[PDB]
Symmetry: D2
Subunit: 284 residues, 4 copies
């Protein structure tokens, strides 16, 4: 499996044409699963889920979707609340591809999008696996913005290699995962005019008047499916105290916390994450 | 596998002769694992771990040990802090059977004993799996004693079938697991003079001057092994807020919480519990 | 100041004529404050606030309102979601008395009423003082229903003096406050057909299509006033973990917790409560 | 009251002669209270408590002590665990001044010193008021080191005005409190060779064989006096989740949390802090 071999495009309608890029693997496996990546600058499906797609594609039909504003998906200069925007894009893709009810796997911003989709289109979402998720997290103890969010904002204002490296170092427990090569690759993607347009567009929308759609901790008592919350104990972006309202209020919730793990569970605990996900989604 | 086929006795020395009863299965599997049951009146290894021993014995050499005061182990009228007493008994058994470093699985009181053993004899304890554990739990929000502990104390003072049924109903999320047959079986065992002697002996020791040995939330930062904390979200004996100091301070901690699950994780989520335990202890 | 000297009646329109009983004191004082009592069987304004009304009336114009279903207020057999019902009645009284913007003090169910009032009629509510409040509390760790709520439910089904004393004992840290005289007085009021009809109607009103109106932890991020949350560390009805969403999300929140204090802060810590309330509402 | 009019020196024996600087006020008043300042670079008694000493001196005989390594107290290059070192110095002063049992007020590192003093010399410590305290805090959710501690460590390695201003900005909610004048004054004191030597020595003293002396959350269950914990909801050095073990385990604990308040409660909420402290210590 390569970036190129798995690369697919679809055109959907969200207030006009929207090109989505995604990766497909494990075609012919009985169970489809959709993967939604995190929202750090330069993030995309293939790099976010590199330690996971090959393994999950042994069990499932994997669709790893670049969210709008990321990777090779369209990078519009303006949009509404990001998770509802991305959920509308995903609904478009579900309809185009003829998907019925599909489990979703989402880290951080992608977890927010998975939840918004599961709330707005409840018949179309199956089991959820949510890693350090945004949206349904509310940091009952951590002052907002967190150290992690502050470093993301600093990059947005001053998009330098130094500021991107700083934000990446608070994503992980083992800072040796942040190699000069990773920093170089992410900075090249994050600093394009189009990517900076998408990060400028993103800025407005979470602070805009559409904000209530983002406060999904208010809504997840409505989720009827099993939901597996996965957290790194050392997550400095969406810290562990953000799990508590979702764990309490989602009837069929589970939580798994990994010690010695930051915000990139799917990378830092890739084997344990892969095994939890395979078992939770039914072994495929 | 039956109670009778797996039944074993050993005599160890803890301030004199002490007969321990245990169950053995999976002899010849490379990895030995020790199971330590919860401390509810009438509790013992076989009934506590009935949905687990057969499954774990496919992968591991299982030793399910009746703690002192329970099942067919000696029921002395007096002892020190219960977890250190039970840990000294287990050290005696480890030495008699020639065990080296062995993983421990413990629910509630048995989790306390596993931790006390791992702290006092660190070279002899491997990975720990601790379900709604006592000792290393400290209920940061729940007023003590909890609803669960109060019902246990009420039974001790007034050892009636009605008071035992009341305590068993706050052990589980699905109160239909508390059948008239379970109540009858547990009451027959719990109400013997010898069992009431052991429950009278137990009363003193947690309230005695030896109490600090029980406050294992103060000590678990010393544990060097991986530790899997497992909780029922609806545990009314040792509630979920009791997990937080251990999760923070044990370097290689993990936590798994099951929604729609009380204090008997190994019964109410037996399949998920079995799978977590098998994977965590290395697949055997 | 006596029950009789302070006693007042109003008739307001709440889906038809509704008689409200209240106590008025400190008529000389410029700053009006409304007091809303707890919802335990046989509760009313004068008894709930017996250690507070005289002290507060030195500083403030006190209006202590018997909520619908309690004391000498109307006890309808049918009504909607209780806190919205009680808030509508209070709104009717505000309009009749020509009140503008007024601070509210409420314990438990009265705290829920104060919050519902402050959300539904935001310009009419000033500073809030809320003691072990319902509605904006969500018990992130404690399994629901709590020991306290279960004992209230048991009394509703089996309204005996024994079941009332059992509920009253889990409302305080110092059980000696639950005198035979207090139990006899509360039970004589609680056991009337009119009072029991109200108690059951209040219970049923929390479950139905509009249960969202009770989930005020979703809404209090919108409160613009200073809010003083006051909790007893040992509250077994609305435990301390219920404070966290409100403390995090109300911009001008404060929290005071008293150790060695249960669910009746205004009784158990009356002097500390009186001083906190006088200072917080501006000394009068 | 001026810095100069209140200024006092003592020489105590702490593994050799130790000069202590302190401020004395309210010499007429019967109730003595000791104030212990925070440990940020360039901190001292008079500046830490500039909004408190005059108000408290109306009620109490105030002793505001420059802790070793700060202000005009000796700045040794070598010492043991800092809070035990500072507590031993305070004990020396207690004995010299003929003090019996005296209440202590301490923020952050000073709070840690107050607790270590109250544990090591239990008969000498009265009521405690502890604001965002170190030592008895354990951050159950926040990854350590916190944003605040990391900025202090960065200043220690690179003692620039820019790194001091960055640390000071995460100590308050209202960043306008960090005036150019305050930064210039704190940096001129912090940057001296004597002060930097002390700052580094204090940092190193928390890591070594006796690190247990810093883990005071293990020990405060033994405190018999009333303890008022005071926190800013937005404390980014010692965050609010650090309050929970102390609140649970100190029998006569109270907690006050201020919304829209960081790590300098005594400055940011000076009037509310002064009133809480005067009432809690018995009005004087
Ligand atoms: P995950 O890592 O996707 O979540 C990171 C935080 C997402 C929310 C960001 C809010 C501030 C955005 C600033 C835009 C430059
Ligand atoms: P697990 O279910 O084993 O833990 C139950 C509580 C254990 C501690 C009991 C303390 C009170 C004992 C009363 C003796 C009658
Ligand atoms: P405060 O002590 O007023 O709050 C107690 C709980 C009030 C709501 C109870 C609803 C469920 C139980 C009702 C039984 C009729
Ligand atoms: P308060 O603001 O006094 O507490 C701040 C932290 C004090 C302890 C810091 C230890 C680690 C960093 C030291 C750097 C030299």
């Amino acid at each position: 499996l390569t970036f190129e071999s798995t690369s697919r495009f679809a055109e959907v309608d969200v207030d006009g044409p929207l090109k989505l890029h995604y990766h497909e693997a494990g075609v012919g496996n009985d169970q489809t699963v959709v993967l939604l990546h995190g929202g750090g600058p330069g993030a995309a499906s293939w790099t976010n889920f590199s330690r996971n797609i090959a393994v999950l594609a042994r069990h499932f039909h994997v669709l790893a979707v670049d969210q709008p504003g990321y990777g090779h998906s369209d990078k519009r200069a303006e949009h509404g609340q990001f998770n509802r925007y991305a959920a509308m894009a995903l609904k478009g893709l579900f309809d185009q591809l003829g998907l019925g009810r599909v489990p979703l796997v989402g880290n951080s911003l992608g977890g927010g999008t998975a939840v918004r989709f599961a709330l707005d289109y409840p018949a179309r979402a199956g089991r959820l696996v949510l890693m350090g998720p945004g949206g349904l997290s509310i940091n009952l103890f951590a002052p907002d913005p967190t150290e992690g969010v502050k470093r993301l904002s600093k990059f947005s204002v001053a998009p330098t290699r130094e500021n991107l490296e700083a934000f990446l170092r608070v994503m992980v427990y083992d800072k040796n995962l942040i190699t000069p090569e990773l920093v170089d690759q992410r900075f090249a993607l994050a600093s394009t005019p189009e990517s900076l347009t998408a990060t400028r567009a993103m800025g407005k929308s979470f602070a805009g008047a559409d904000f209530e759609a983002g406060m999904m901790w208010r809504e997840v008592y409505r989720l009827r499916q099993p939901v597996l919350l996965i957290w790194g104990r050392e997550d400095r972006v969406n810290p562990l105290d953000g799990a508590l309202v979702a764990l309490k209020t989602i009837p069929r919730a589970q939580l798994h916390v990994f010690g010695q793990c930051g915000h990139w569970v799917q990378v830092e605990k890739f084997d344990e994450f892969n095994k939890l996900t395979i078992e939770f989604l039914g072994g495929g």
